[PDB]
Design a protein around this ligand. Structure first.
Ligand SMILES: CC(C)c1ccccc1-c1nc(NCc2ccccn2)c2c(ccn2C)n1
Ligand SMILES: CC(C)c1ccccc1-c1nc(NCc2ccccn2)c2c(ccn2C)n1
Lengths: 294, 292
């Protein structure tokens, strides 16, 4: 595909540019309004793999580089992960690094515009909690272009594992209205189940009091932050593996199952799928709901 | 300097793109109309070394890559030579003129009008080079670029150095064999290594002593080189002649004969070039055949 080829070229190009720049000690207001653009135009050359006209734009290169650092990702390992072997495509557009450490989700221009408003607060928040959050870990944000058709790509750390594959998968909002996976959905090998499917299966999460106190104190301040930003309609992604992964929690010793849990916050924007009441209230309902999965 | 920074960035960038492409076995007519352009534009990012706005264009990437190959230059060694260390500047050309740190390459700024002319003859030049197996007194063109910094485009042209990477030139002549007197000005002769001309050559009574075998070869080369320049309707070219007195790769170099009055090394090749002419050639050949 052209869009992926240009994307992988652009990542390689931008990481190389950044190796020349030394990392600042401190970000500045302008670093969050910054970009790097490249317009390439090969006439009667290179016919292989890339198109002859394309653009590539990295949003806030200094901020994303600092976020990669703060989430313990090295710029060379980031490049290796996205380019050394091609990413796989999952069901817009939604790709996983060969090594299954990273996720690349196509988004809309209006999504990029939303991301820009809160990137500064997000950065402050990340510094303040030392990269330790259930929120998505944003690693980079790009606009690849092919003949005046722009496509916005957004890279996040995978909330799921590089090794242990997910057997069951839930999107939990704690809605008053029925949240049920449709029949169309349940024909998939690993379908995205919802609130009602969770309650009907009588699913519980068994992790132990120490681990749970930590997880819920994390979720509380993550959610308080989302309220602060006047954001809502987020879900807890919950993946379960029946028998470095920053979102993973082992089953307690007492547990009725040898299980590993993967939990983090998501959105229509940040969902692990292709692109398709007051916020203080949404939070309280949401927290009640997900406090009762243990 | 911005222009050199962008130039060296572009060379590195263009050689890297070419490492992805495998070299064709055969060029096509389109390879000689081809180009690679890049416009970079960083808003609020990294006002350091490169500017935030610039373009870079490589003319005929496939053709210059084939020419580098045909003149026995490896694309990696070419990149190493232009970028590993910064080039030095000389001030004897009508624009910028740089020498690779390793003194194997020369980078001469030219004009848009020059580039337009030189483009039309690159195909015939390529034919000619294949036909003579890279072995010519003409410049060995290795690459051809347009770096742009603000509104201001500057066309750069890379050639193998006709002079040496080791043995430095002590004396230096530009010979046309003009009807008018060609004389170095007084301003000039104050320089450490001045560019002397026809009349200065004749007055100093300079001769070139190389031996009849080596001279027959050199003159048969110059004849077909010059016949080619006529074919291209080109004139106002000079023979560059540099001399190393033995008091202290090089494809243009010839050692003094045994019988010679001096242990000297000569560097000769054609310059101010790839674009009445029948006349210019005859005068030019007569003149330079009489330097031996
Ligand atoms: C806090 C949020 C992660 C974020 C980080 C950086 C910069 C901006 C944002 C953002 N994220 C959106 N959604 C994604 C989302 C929301 C909640 C949980 C998980 N993922 C947003 C907005 C504004 C409207 N929407 C829909 N801002
Ligand atoms: C065109 C050049 C400006 C020039 C004009 C008149 C007379 C001489 C020269 C000259 N030619 C050098 N190189 C040999 C060379 C030149 C061109 C192509 C290939 N090779 C020079 C310098 C200074 C250092 N070098 C190495 N000047």
């Amino acid at each position: 595909d052209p869009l992926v080829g240009v994307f992988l070229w652009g990542v390689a190009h931008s990481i190389n540019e950044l190796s020349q720049v030394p990392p600042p000690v401190m970000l500045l207001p302008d670093d969050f309004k910054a970009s790097s653009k490249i317009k390439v135009n090969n006439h009667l050359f290179h016919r292989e793999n890339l198109p002859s006209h394309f653009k590539f734009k990295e949003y806030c290169p200094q901020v994303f580089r600092n976020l990669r650092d703060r989430f313990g990702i090295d710029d060379q390992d980031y490049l290796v992960s996205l380019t050394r072997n091609p990413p796989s495509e999952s069901e817009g557009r939604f790709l996983i690094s060969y090594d299954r450490t990273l996720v690349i989700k196509e988004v809309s221009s209006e999504d990029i515009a939303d991301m820009h408003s809160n990137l500064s607060n997000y950065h402050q928040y990340i510094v303040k909690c030392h990269g330790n959050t259930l929120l998505p870990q944003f690693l980079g944000m790009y606009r690849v272009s092919v003949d005046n058709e722009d496509s916005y790509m957004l890279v996040m750390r995978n909330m799921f594992s590089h090794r242990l594959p997910v057997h069951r998968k839930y999107d939990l909002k704690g809605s008053l209205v029925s949240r049920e996976a449709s029949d169309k959905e349940k024909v998939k090998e690993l379908p995205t189940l919802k609130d009602m499917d969770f309650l009907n299966k009588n699913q519980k999460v068994y992790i132990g009091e120490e681990e749970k106190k930590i997880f819920l104190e994390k979720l509380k301040r993550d959610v308080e932050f989302l309220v602060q930003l006047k954001i809502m309609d987020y879900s807890l992604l919950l993946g379960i593996h029946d028998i470095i992964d920053v979102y993973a929690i082992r089953s307690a010793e007492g547990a009725p199952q040898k299980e590993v849990y993967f939990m983090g916050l998501i959105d229509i924007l940040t969902q692990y799928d292709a692109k398709k009441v007051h916020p203080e209230q949404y939070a309280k309902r949401f927290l009640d709901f997900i406090t009762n999965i243990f």
